[PDB]
Amino acid sequence: IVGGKVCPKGECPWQVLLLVNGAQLCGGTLINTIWVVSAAHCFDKIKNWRNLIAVLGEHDLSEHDGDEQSRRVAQVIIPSTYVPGTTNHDIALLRLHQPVVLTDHVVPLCLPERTFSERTLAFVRFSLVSGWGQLLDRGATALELMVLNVPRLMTQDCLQQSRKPNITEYMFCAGYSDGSKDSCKGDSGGPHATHYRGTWYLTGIVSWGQGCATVGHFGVYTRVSQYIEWLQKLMRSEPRPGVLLRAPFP
Amino acid sequence: ICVNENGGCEQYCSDHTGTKRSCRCHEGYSLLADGVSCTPTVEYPCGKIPILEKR
Numbered sequence: 001i002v003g004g005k006v007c008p009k010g011e012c013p014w015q016v017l018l019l020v021n022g023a024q025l026c027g028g029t030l031i032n033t034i035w036v037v038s039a040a041h042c043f044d045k046i047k048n049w050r051n052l053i054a055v056l057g058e059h060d061l062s063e064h065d066g067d068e069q070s071r072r073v074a075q076v077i078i079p080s081t082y083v084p085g086t087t088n089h090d091i092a093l094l095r096l097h098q099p100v101v102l103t104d105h106v107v108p109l110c111l112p113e114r115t116f117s118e119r120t121l122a123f124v125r126f127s128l129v130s131g132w133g134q135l136l137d138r139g140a141t142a143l144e145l146m147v148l149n150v151p152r153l154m155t156q157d158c159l160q161q162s163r164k165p166n167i168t169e170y171m172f173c174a175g176y177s178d179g180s181k182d183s184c185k186g187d188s189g190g191p192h193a194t195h196y197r198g199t200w201y202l203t204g205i206v207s208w209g210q211g212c213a214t215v216g217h218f219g220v221y222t223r224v225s226q227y228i229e230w231l232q233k234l235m236r237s238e239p240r241p242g243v244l245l246r247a248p249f250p
Numbered sequence: 251i252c253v254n255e256n257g258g259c260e261q262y263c264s265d266h267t268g269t270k271r272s273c274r275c276h277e278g279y280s281l282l283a284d285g286v287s288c289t290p291t292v293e294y295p296c297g298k299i300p301i302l303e304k305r
């Protein structure tokens with residue numbers, strides 16, 4: 001995250017840190033005690049599917065304070081329409097091997113209904129994006145969880161305001177074109193969370209863009225509202241052998 | 251009715267045959283008698299920040 005601030009410990013309680021062989025991979029969002037939403041592109045280079053760990057209640061990577069909860073990722077579910085190395089349909093649904101325990105530091109973000117998200121949440125201007133990604137383009141990643149407030153744009157407006165891929169109906173732009181504030185590649189999979197009448201909801205996933213906080217370019221986020229039905233149906237399904245599952249979309 | 255200001259609902263809104271509207275709530279919440287407000291039914295409802303709620 002470029003140009004944000006440290007998220008005070010426990011104020012981003014749905015933030016997930018994904019690890020592969022103990023190394024920082026991506027962010028994610030806890031949506032109930034066993035399911036995490038992340039980006040499909042987070043898993044393009046994975047060979048060690050059994051060394052994939054989700055950490056909840058994380059804040060500072062340098063110290064263990066006892067609020068962290070680690071779980072093995074039992075399943076990674078990706079839409080059939082997602083093509084590795086590309087931008088469209090950038091979403092993954094992760095089943096934890098054992099549920100996390102909800103506490104003051106581990107709380108799920110609400111996955112909203114599609115109608116509510118499209119007709120109300122899509123019009124809330126600002127939303128928060130968070131993660132332990134790059135603090136600067138070509139710079140170090142953060143040791144403390146960072147958060148940034150970003151405004152959402154209508155796709156026609158994003159296309160008009162951008163300098164020099166397509167922005168599909170499965171994406172939306174958010175951020176600033178002045179190069180000061182953005183989420184980065186290391187924040188990939190993390191939440192874009194929207195506040196409405198006292199409650200936070202999942203509206204986007206940190207997905208793609210150019211460099212980080214590049215002048216003339218906005219951050220591009222997976223439009224979660226397009227996937228509500230797809231996610232709900234998978235959450236009602238029985239686990240299948242093998243970590244990676246490709247599921248038909250729609 | 252749901253298209254306009256979320257039909258007055260705090261969370262979810264369902265339109266019915268005519269001028270009828272029903273508000274609903276995510277799991278871990280119940281609808282109050284006002285027919286619009288959602289109150290938590292669990293210790294850690296989704297989308298609420300405990301350290302801020304307890305403040």
Ligand SMILES: CN1Cc2cc(ccc2S(=O)(=O)C2CC2)NC(=O)CCc2cccc(c2)[C@@H](Nc2ccc3c(N)nccc3c2)C1=O
Pocket residue numbers: 025026041042043044045085086087182183184185186187188206207208209210211212213218219220
């Ligand atoms: C460059 N990487 C790493 C990556 C990428 C792809 C696959 C695997 C990896 S991986 O390293 O194995 C991954 C981290 C574990 N897939 C593709 O290249 C296509 C989609 C895509 C296009 C451009 C940029 C990105 C992603 C980056 N992500 C982002 C995310 C948000 C951005 C933002 N908001 N502003 C600027 C740049 C922002 C950049 C990316 O992940």
Ligand SMILES: [Ca+2]
Pocket residue numbers: 058059060061062063064065068
């Ligand atoms: Ca820690």
